[PDB]
Amino acid sequence: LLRIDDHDFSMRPGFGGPAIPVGVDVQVESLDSISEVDMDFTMTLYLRHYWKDERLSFPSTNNLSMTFDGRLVKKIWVPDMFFVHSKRSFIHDTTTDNVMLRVQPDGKVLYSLRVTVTAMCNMDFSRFPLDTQTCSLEIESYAYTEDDLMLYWKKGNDSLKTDERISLSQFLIQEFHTTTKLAFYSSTGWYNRLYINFTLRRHIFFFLLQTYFPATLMVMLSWVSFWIDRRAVPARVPLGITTVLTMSTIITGVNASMPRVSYIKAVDIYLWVSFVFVFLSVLEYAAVNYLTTVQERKEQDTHAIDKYSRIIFPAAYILFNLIYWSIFS
Amino acid sequence: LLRIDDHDFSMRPGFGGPAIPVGVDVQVESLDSISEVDMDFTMTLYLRHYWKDERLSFPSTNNLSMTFDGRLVKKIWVPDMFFVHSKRSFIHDTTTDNVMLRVQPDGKVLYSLRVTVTAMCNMDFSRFPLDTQTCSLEIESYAYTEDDLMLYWKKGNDSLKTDERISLSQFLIQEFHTTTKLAFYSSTGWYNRLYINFTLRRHIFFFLLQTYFPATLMVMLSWVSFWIDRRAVPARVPLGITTVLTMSTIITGVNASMPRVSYIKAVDIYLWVSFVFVFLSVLEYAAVNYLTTVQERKEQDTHAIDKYSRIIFPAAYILFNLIYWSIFS
Amino acid sequence: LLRIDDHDFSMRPGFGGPAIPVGVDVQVESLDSISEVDMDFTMTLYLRHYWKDERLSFPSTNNLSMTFDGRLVKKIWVPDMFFVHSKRSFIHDTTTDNVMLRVQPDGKVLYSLRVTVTAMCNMDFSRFPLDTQTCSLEIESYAYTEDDLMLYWKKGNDSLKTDERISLSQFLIQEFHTTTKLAFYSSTGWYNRLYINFTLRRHIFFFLLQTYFPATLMVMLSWVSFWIDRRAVPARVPLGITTVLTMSTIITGVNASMPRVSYIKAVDIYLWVSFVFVFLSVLEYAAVNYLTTVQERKEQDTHAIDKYSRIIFPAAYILFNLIYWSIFS
Amino acid sequence: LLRIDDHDFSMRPGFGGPAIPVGVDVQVESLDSISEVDMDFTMTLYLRHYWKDERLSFPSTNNLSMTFDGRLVKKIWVPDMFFVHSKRSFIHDTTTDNVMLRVQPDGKVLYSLRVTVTAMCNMDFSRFPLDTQTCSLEIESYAYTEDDLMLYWKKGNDSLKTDERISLSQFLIQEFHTTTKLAFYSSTGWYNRLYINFTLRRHIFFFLLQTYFPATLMVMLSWVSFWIDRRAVPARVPLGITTVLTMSTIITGVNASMPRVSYIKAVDIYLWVSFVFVFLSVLEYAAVNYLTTVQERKEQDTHAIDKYSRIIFPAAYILFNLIYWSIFS
Amino acid sequence: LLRIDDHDFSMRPGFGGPAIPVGVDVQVESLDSISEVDMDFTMTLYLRHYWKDERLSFPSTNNLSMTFDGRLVKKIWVPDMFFVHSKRSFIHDTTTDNVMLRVQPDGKVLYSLRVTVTAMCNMDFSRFPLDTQTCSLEIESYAYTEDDLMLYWKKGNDSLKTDERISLSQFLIQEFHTTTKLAFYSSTGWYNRLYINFTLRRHIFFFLLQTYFPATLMVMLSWVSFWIDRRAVPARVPLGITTVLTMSTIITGVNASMPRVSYIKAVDIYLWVSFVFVFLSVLEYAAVNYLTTVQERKEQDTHAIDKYSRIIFPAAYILFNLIYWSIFS
Ligand SMILES: *[C@@H]1O[C@H](CO)[C@@H](O)[C@H](O)[C@H]1NC(C)=O
Ligand SMILES: *[C@@H]1O[C@H](CO)[C@@H](O)[C@H](O)[C@H]1NC(C)=O
Ligand SMILES: *[C@@H]1O[C@H](CO)[C@@H](O)[C@H](O)[C@H]1NC(C)=O
Ligand SMILES: *[C@@H]1O[C@H](CO)[C@@H](O)[C@H](O)[C@H]1NC(C)=O
Ligand SMILES: *[C@@H]1O[C@H](CO)[C@@H](O)[C@H](O)[C@H]1NC(C)=O
Ligand SMILES: *[C@@H]1O[C@H](CO)[C@@H](O)[C@H](O)[C@H]1NC(C)=O
Ligand SMILES: *[C@@H]1O[C@H](CO)[C@@H](O)[C@H](O)[C@H]1NC(C)=O
Ligand SMILES: *[C@@H]1O[C@H](CO)[C@@H](O)[C@H](O)[C@H]1NC(C)=O
Ligand SMILES: *[C@@H]1O[C@H](CO)[C@@H](O)[C@H](O)[C@H]1NC(C)=O
Ligand SMILES: *[C@@H]1O[C@H](CO)[C@@H](O)[C@H](O)[C@H]1NC(C)=O
Ligand SMILES: CCCCCCCC
Ligand SMILES: CCCCCCCC
Ligand SMILES: CCCCCCCC
Ligand SMILES: CCCCCCCC
Ligand SMILES: CCCCCCCC
Ligand SMILES: CCCCCCCC
Ligand SMILES: CCCCCCCC
Ligand SMILES: CCCCCCCC
Ligand SMILES: CCCCCCCC
Ligand SMILES: CCCCCCCC
Ligand SMILES: CCCCCC
Ligand SMILES: CCCCCC
Ligand SMILES: CCCCCC
Ligand SMILES: CCCCCC
Ligand SMILES: CCCCCC
Ligand SMILES: CCCCCC
Ligand SMILES: CCCCCC
Ligand SMILES: CCCCCC
Ligand SMILES: CCCCCC
Ligand SMILES: CCCCCC
Ligand SMILES: CCCCCC
Ligand SMILES: CCCCCC
Ligand SMILES: CCCCCC
Ligand SMILES: CCCCCC
Ligand SMILES: CCCCCC
Ligand SMILES: [Cl-]
Ligand SMILES: [Cl-]
Structure with a gap:
C-alpha cells in the first residue's frame, strides 16, 4: 500500500527548501520518584508527533486514517527529539516496542511512543523541611536548526494532559503548565525548546x-x-x-x-x-x-x-x- | 510450508473492514516481591493469544495443529499488548527466546510467551501493621482501538490459572479473579482493558x-x-x-x-x-x-x-x- | 561444506512424524551465592545437547567429527530448553558468544554453551541457625510436547559432573544427584522435566x-x-x-x-x-x-x-x- | 544524493599515503557525581569531529551545508575515538540515537554525538576535609597511529565550552583548560592524546x-x-x-x-x-x-x-x- | 582490497589438517576493586592475538602492515578466547567498538580489543588483618582442542606489561608473572590454558x-x-x-x-x-x-x-x- 521502495528517506520532507513544521502534545502517566541527594526526579509519559509527508500518500474512497504494524517506522523518515539535561531514559518494549503509526490518504502522519525519563533539578534547602520546589522537563531536536525544523505545541495550552492517579507520599503536586524558548549553541546554531513546568510542596x-x-x-x-x-x-x-x-x-x-x-x-x-x-x-x-x-x-x-x-x-x-x-x- | 513471501504483514487481518477478535488466557508462575517504600509489586507469568489469519493456511490430511521454530514470529503479523501503569518488564531469552507458535491448517493461530512485570500499587497504612491491601495488573493494546481490535478473556472466568507453589513470607494471598472495562484517551480514542485482581493480608x-x-x-x-x-x-x-x-x-x-x-x-x-x-x-x-x-x-x-x-x-x-x-x- | 541453503530449518527433524530424541549432560562450574531474604541461589554451568539431523550430513573419508565457527547456530535448527521457576539468566559473550558446534559426517550433532542462572528455593527456618536445606534446578522444553520431543539424561546417573573448586564460606555442600518427572499444563499439554538436586548444611x-x-x-x-x-x-x-x-x-x-x-x-x-x-x-x-x-x-x-x-x-x-x-x- | 554505493568505506581517506587530520571541540553539559571510596567522577558532554572526504562530494548551486538523517553514519567511514582510563560510558538513544551528520558539497564533514563517561581520578586525603583535588579526561584514537591519523584541538584554547548550570553541592569548581601529549605503547606504536583539566575545592x-x-x-x-x-x-x-x-x-x-x-x-x-x-x-x-x-x-x-x-x-x-x-x- | 567474498570463513585456517598456532600478549590497565564478602576482583586490560591466514593476502610493493576499519572483524574468521572461572565481563563500545585489525600482504594478522573482567579468588582470613593473598586470571579457547588450535605466550615472559598508574588504597601489589598448563574436560577433550598471577599485601x-x-x-x-x-x-x-x-x-x-x-x-x-x-x-x-x-x-x-x-x-x-x-x- 505505502510506496516505501520508491524514495530516499535519508532526507527530510522539503529538503533544500523551507522548514518543516512539527507539532507536539503529551500525557503524563506518573511522577515516579525524587531524590534530594542526587537532585533529580523520574517521570513516565506518552509523547506524540504530527506532520505531513506526501511521499506517504495513498488512494482510498473513505478519506479516513489507517493504522500500520510498527515495523515501518525504521524505513520512513521520523523527527529526532531528545530530552535536554537528562541523566538517563528508555523506550518500553514488552511485548513489543510501545510505538504507534497512523497515516491519512493525503500523507498526514501521527506518531506516538511511551517513555521513562530521569532529569536534573536544582534544589534549595534553606527552609527545609518547610520548603517549596519547582521543576521542568525540556524537549528539543538534536540535528536540525530552526532553519530546517519548526517545533511547537499542537493545541496551545491544551497540549498537556495528566493522569488522575498521579500521587507522591511526601509532596503535594500543583501548577502544571507549558512554555517555549529559543536556545543557542556556539558551534551549531539556534533551536526551539519546549518546557513542561510544575511545583511541589512537602508535608x-x-x-x-x-x-x-x-x-x-x-x-x-x-x-x-x-x-x-x-x-x-x-x-x-x-x-x-x-x-x-x-x-x-x-x-x-x-x-x-x-x-x-x-x-x-x-x-x-x-x-x-x-x-x-x-x-x-x-x-x-x-x-x-x-x-x-x-x-x-x-x-x-x-x-x-x-x-x-x-x-x-x-x-x-x-x-x-x-x-x-x-x-x- | 507457510507462504510467508506472498503477503504484506504490515497490515492486520481484515484491514479496512471490521475488527479482529483476539482472545487471551494466563497462568501466574510467581508473585516475586513487594515494596511499601516504592509502592509496587513484581509478577512472573505465562501469557497466551488466540486468533485466525487465512494468510497462514496450509494443506494437510490430518487436520491437526503444528509447532514451528519461533524465528517466524518476526515475519508474520502479531497482536500488540502492553502492561498499563507498569514500571519495567522483560521477556526471558535463555537458552533462546521463550516464545511458542502453533498453527492449524485453516489458519487458526496460538501464540505464547513468558514475562516478568513490575507494577504500581497504591497502599493505605492507617491500620498498619494490621492492614489489608488489594492489587491489580492491567492489559491493553497499544495501537488499535475497539474499531479495529476486539480483546476478551478466552474462556470467561476460567481464563486464569495459578501455580500451587506461590507464596510470600509476610502475606497471605487470596481472592484471585478477572474483570473488564473500557478506557478513553482524548487524543486517540476508545480501548478494551483486561484486569487481574488479588488481595493480601499481613502476618x-x-x-x-x-x-x-x-x-x-x-x-x-x-x-x-x-x-x-x-x-x-x-x-x-x-x-x-x-x-x-x-x-x-x-x-x-x-x-x-x-x-x-x-x-x-x-x-x-x-x-x-x-x-x-x-x-x-x-x-x-x-x-x-x-x-x-x-x-x-x-x-x-x-x-x-x-x-x-x-x-x-x-x-x-x-x-x-x-x-x-x-x-x- | 554443509548444505545450509537447501533446507527449511523452521521445521524440526522428523516434522509430522514421531518425536525426536534429545539427550543432555551437564558440568557445574560454581555455586555463586545464596539469599535467605530473597529465598534464591545462583549457579554457573556448562550445558550440552545431542541429536541427529540428516540435513547436516557431509562426505569424508576419515569418519571423524569436525568443529565449526559458531555463527552457523543461527541458521540451522536447535532445541529450545529453558530453566523452570527461574528469576533471571544469561549466556556469556566475551570475547565472543561462548558456544560450540560439532558435527559428524552422518549428521550427528553436539552443541554446548555456558550460562549463569538464578533460581527459586523455598526455605524453612524453624531450626535456624542449626538448619539443613535442599535445592533443585529444573530444565524443560518450551514449545514442544512429549509427542514431538523426547528429553532424557544422556548417560543416566553419570550425566552430572562437578568442579573440584566449588565452595561456600557458610555452608557444607553435599548429595548432588539427578531425577526426571512429567509435567502438565492445562492449555498446552504434557512435557518431560529434568532435575538437578543438592543439600546444604550451615556452619x-x-x-x-x-x-x-x-x-x-x-x-x-x-x-x-x-x-x-x-x-x-x-x-x-x-x-x-x-x-x-x-x-x-x-x-x-x-x-x-x-x-x-x-x-x-x-x-x-x-x-x-x-x-x-x-x-x-x-x-x-x-x-x-x-x-x-x-x-x-x-x-x-x-x-x-x-x-x-x-x-x-x-x-x-x-x-x-x-x-x-x-x-x- | 550521496554516492554511498560506489566506494569501499572499510578504508580511510588517504589510505596508503599521508595521515588524515581530524579536529575536535567539546561542550560540557554537567559534572554529575564524585566518589572518594571509588576514586572516580562522572561527566556528560557533547563531542564534535571535523574532516574532509571527497567520496562524499555532491553538486549544488548554493555552496551551503546540508543535514542528513543519521542512519548513514553506519555506511560511511568515521573516526574511532575512545576515552582512556575510563571505567564505563554510553551514548544516549531516546527517542533515537543522539547523533548528527552535516556535509558540504566539497566533502567537508561535521559529526556530533552526546555521551556520559565515568573516569579514574587519584585522590590525596592528607589534608582532608581542607583538601584540593585536580582531575582530567583523556581522549585518543584506538586503531590508528600518528602515521595515519593526526588529532588536534580545532580552535586552540577556544575549543572547550561549559554550561552555565554546572554545580556540585560539596565542591567549588574552577580552572577548566585543555592540553596535548604524545603516548607510546610497546607493541603498537605512537599516538596523540588530548586532555581536559579542572580543579575542585571542598566546602x-x-x-x-x-x-x-x-x-x-x-x-x-x-x-x-x-x-x-x-x-x-x-x-x-x-x-x-x-x-x-x-x-x-x-x-x-x-x-x-x-x-x-x-x-x-x-x-x-x-x-x-x-x-x-x-x-x-x-x-x-x-x-x-x-x-x-x-x-x-x-x-x-x-x-x-x-x-x-x-x-x-x-x-x-x-x-x-x-x-x-x-x-x- | 581484501577478497572477503571468495571464501567460507565458517572454517578455520588449516581445517582438516594440523593445528593452527595462535600467540598472545597482554597489557594491564587497572586493577579496579576487591571484595572479601564476594571473594572476587575486577581487572581492565588490553588483549592481543597473532596468526596467519593466506585467504587474507593482498598485493603491494611496500611490504608494510595496513589498518582496516573494524567492521570486517565480523566477516572473517577469528579465534575464540574466554576467561575461565569468571563471574561477568564486557567489551567497551563508546564511541564505537574498541577493536583493532591490522594485516600484512602475506596474510599475517594482528587483532586487539579492550575488556573488563570480574573473576573468582579464594581467600584465607586466619591471619586477618595481617594476611597475604595470591590471585590469577585464566585464559582458554572455548571450542577447539589442542588437536586443532595451539595457544602460547607470544614472547615468553616478556608477554605481560603493566600500567605505571596501577594502585589500590588498601593493598601493596607485587609479583606479576605468567604460566601455562593443560586442562581436561571429560566430555570434550584436552585444552591449553594460560595464567596471569599476582600477590597482594594489606596495610x-x-x-x-x-x-x-x-x-x-x-x-x-x-x-x-x-x-x-x-x-x-x-x-x-x-x-x-x-x-x-x-x-x-x-x-x-x-x-x-x-x-x-x-x-x-x-x-x-x-x-x-x-x-x-x-x-x-x-x-x-x-x-x-x-x-x-x-x-x-x-x-x-x-x-x-x-x-x-x-x-x-x-x-x-x-x-x-x-x-x-x-x-x-
Ligand atoms: C475526508 O475528506 C473528504 C474529502 O476527501 C471529505 O468529504 C470528508 O468530509 C472528510 N472527512 C473528515 C472526517 O474530515
Ligand atoms: C497559557 O495561556 C496563557 C494565555 O492567557 C498565557 O498566559 C500563558 O503563557 C500560558 N500560561 C502559562 C502559565 O504558561
Ligand atoms: C479436524 O477437522 C476434520 C475435518 O477437516 C474433522 O474430521 C476432525 O474431526 C477434526 N478434528 C478435531 C480434533 O477437531
Ligand atoms: C466471575 O463470574 C461471575 C458470574 O457469576 C461474575 O459475577 C463475576 O464478574 C466474575 N467474578 C468476579 C469476582 O469478577
Ligand atoms: C567411523 O566410521 C567408520 C565407518 O564409516 C569406521 O570404520 C570407524 O571405525 C569409525 N570410527 C569411530 C571412532 O567410531
Ligand atoms: C541413580 O541411580 C539409581 C540406580 O540404582 C537410582 O536409584 C536413582 O534414582 C539414582 N539416584 C538418585 C539418588 O536419584
Ligand atoms: C561558498 O562557496 C562559494 C563558491 O563555491 C562562494 O562564492 C561563497 O562565498 C561561499 N560561502 C561561504 C559562506 O563560505
Ligand atoms: C592556553 O593558551 C596558552 C597561550 O598563552 C598556553 O599557555 C596554554 O598552554 C593554554 N593554557 C593552559 C593553561 O593550558
Ligand atoms: C618486507 O618484505 C620485503 C620483501 O617482501 C623485504 O625486502 C623488507 O625488508 C621487509 N621489511 C620488513 C620491515 O620486514
Ligand atoms: C619466567 O622465566 C623463567 C626462566 O628462567 C621461568 O623460570 C619461569 O617459569 C618464569 N617465571 C615465573 C615466575 O613464572
Ligand atoms: C535568616 C535567619 C533567621 C534566623 C531567625 C532566628 C529565630 C530565633
Ligand atoms: C514543639 C513542636 C511545635 C510544632 C508547631 C507547629 C506549628 C504549625
Ligand atoms: C481513629 C482514631 C482511633 C483512636 C483510638 C484510640 C484508642 C485508645
Ligand atoms: C502486649 C502485646 C499484646 C498483644 C495482643 C494481641 C492480641 C491479638
Ligand atoms: C518445639 C518447641 C521446642 C521448645 C523446647 C523448649 C526447650 C527449653
Ligand atoms: C553458651 C553457648 C553454649 C554452646 C554449646 C554448643 C554445643 C555444641
Ligand atoms: C605534618 C604533621 C602536622 C602535625 C601538626 C600538629 C599540630 C598540633
Ligand atoms: C572549634 C571549631 C573551630 C573552627 C575554626 C575554623 C576557623 C576557620
Ligand atoms: C594458632 C593459635 C595461636 C594462638 C596464640 C595465642 C597467643 C596468646
Ligand atoms: C596496642 C596496639 C599495639 C600495636 C603494635 C603493632 C606492632 C607492629
Ligand atoms: C550562621 C551560622 C550559625 C551557626 C550556629 C551554631
Ligand atoms: C517538675 C514539677 C514538680 C512540681 C512539684 C509541685
Ligand atoms: C508556644 C507555641 C506557640 C507557637 C504558635 C505558632
Ligand atoms: C492526630 C495527631 C496525634 C498526635 C499524637 C502525638
Ligand atoms: C515490684 C514488686 C515488688 C513487690 C514486693 C512485695
Ligand atoms: C489486657 C490485655 C487484654 C486484651 C484482650 C484483647
Ligand atoms: C510460641 C510463642 C512463644 C512466645 C515467646 C515470647
Ligand atoms: C561473684 C563471686 C563472688 C564470690 C566471693 C567469694
Ligand atoms: C551446661 C552446658 C552443657 C550442655 C552440653 C550439651
Ligand atoms: C603519625 C602517627 C600518629 C598516631 C597518633 C595516635
Ligand atoms: C563551670 C563554671 C562554674 C563557675 C562557678 C563560679
Ligand atoms: C582559639 C581559636 C582561635 C583560632 C583562630 C584561627
Ligand atoms: C578456638 C576457639 C577459641 C574460642 C575463644 C572464645
Ligand atoms: C590511676 C593512677 C593513680 C596514681 C595515683 C598516685
Ligand atoms: C608491650 C608492647 C611491646 C610489643 C613489641 C612488639
Ligand atoms: Cl550514685
Ligand atoms: Cl548508653
Missing part, C-alpha cells in the same frame, strides 16, 4: 513527630532538675548530662539523611538552639554547688539561682518558639 | 515480638519505682530516666523502615501512648521529693502519692489496652 | 561466638548482684537495669538480618528465655528492699531471698541449657 | 558543624569536674567516664565514611588529641582521691591539683587550637 | 587506629578501679560495668564487616582476650565487697586483693602482648 507531619517533638521533650526534662534538693549531687548531675548526650544523637540522626550543603537549614537552627538550652542547665548546677561550698568554708532552703531558673528557662524557650514559628510559619 | 507475629512486647516491658519497669524507699534519690531518678530514653529508641527504630506518609499509623498510637505513661512516672517522683522537702522545712512511711500510684498506673494501662485491641481487633 | 561457629556467648555473659553478670550488700541501693539497682537494656540490643541485632517469617526460630527461644532470667533479677532486689523497709517500720546480715537466689538462679539456667541442646543437638 | 561548613564543634563541647564538659567538691565521688567519676565514651563514638562515626588509606588525615589529628585531653581528666581525679585517702590514713578545702587544673587544661587546649589552625589555615 | 595502619588501640584503652580504664577507696561502692561498680559493655560494641563492630567464616581470625583472639581481662576486674571487686562484709559481721586501709591486683593485671596484659606480636609479627 511536614513526619518531621514534627520525628524531630521537633523529641527535642522539645529533652528540653523539658532538663527543667526537672530545678525542683530537686541541691544536696542530691549524684542525682542532679547525671540528669543534666544524659539529656546533653541524647540531644547530640538527635542532631546526628537528622543530618545523616541530607546532602552536605554549605549553608544552614531551618531544622538545624531549632536543634542547635535546643542544645544550648540543655547545656546551660549543667553550668547552672555547677555554680550552685560551688557557691554552696564557699558558704560551707565561711561557716566552718532553696538557692536564689534555683528560684530564678524555675521562671527564666521556660519563659525564654516559649519566646524562642514564638519567634521561630513567626519566621517559618 | 502480625513479627511485630508483636519485635515492637509491642518490648514497649510493654519498659512500661512495666517504670512501675517498680513506686515500691522503692523515697529516700533513695540516686536510685529512683535514673530508674525513670533510662526507661524514657529507651522508649525513644524503640519509636525511632520502627519509623525508620516505612515511607514518610502524612498521617498517623496504628503502631504510632501505641508507642506514643506508652511514652507518656513512662514520662509521667518521672514527674510523680519529682513531686514527692519536693513535698518531702517542704515537710523538712516545716519540721525544722509511704507518701500518699506512692500509695495511690501503685494502683492507678497499672489500671489505666490495662484500660488502654482493652480499648486499643477492641478498635484494631 | 554454626559464627553464631556461637556472635550471639549465644554474649547472651550467656549478660545472664552471668546479673548474678553478681546477689553477692553485694543489700544496703548499697544505687549499686545494685543499675547493675540489674543495664543488663536488661543490653539484652534488648542483642535481641534486636539478631532479628534485623532475617526475613519476617510468621513463626519462631530456634535462636529466638534462647534469647527471650535469657531475657526473662535477667528481668527477674530486678524484681528480686525490689522485693528485698521493700521487706527491709517493712522491718524498719516495725523496729521503729543476708536476707533469705539473697541466700536462696545464689543457688536457684544458676541451677535453673543450667537445667535450661541441658534441655535446649538436647532438643537442637 | 568545610558541614564538617565544622558535624565534627569539630561536638568534639570541642565534650572537652569543655570534662572541665566542669574541676569545680565540684572532691567528696562527691559518684558524681565526679561518671562525669569523666561518659565523656570518654562519647568521644569514641565521634571518632568512629567520622572514619566509617572514608576509604581505608594507610596514612593519617587532618581530621584524625584533632579528634585523637581531643581524646587524650578527655582521658587525662579521669587520671587527675583518681590521683586526688588516692592522695586524700593517704591523708586520712595519716590523720587516723580545694586540693592543689584541682586548683592548678582549672588553669592548665583550658590554656593547653587553646594553644593546641592556635597551632592547628595555623598549620591547616 | 595494617587503619586497623591499629580503628580497633587495637581503643580495646587497649578500655583495658587500661578498668585498672583505675584498683586505686579507688573500697568504700565508694556506687563509683567502683559502674566503672567496671561500663567498660564491659563498651568492649562488646567494639567486638560487634569489627565482625559486622567480614564474611561469616567457620574459623577464628587473628583479630578475634585479641578482642576476646581483652574482654576476659575486663570481665575479671568486676569479679575482683565483688570479692572485696563480700569479704569486707564478712569482716563487719565478725567485728559486730587497702585490702590485700587490691594491693596485688595493682601489680598482677598490668604485668599479665604486657606478657600477652609480647606473645601475640611474636606470633603474628
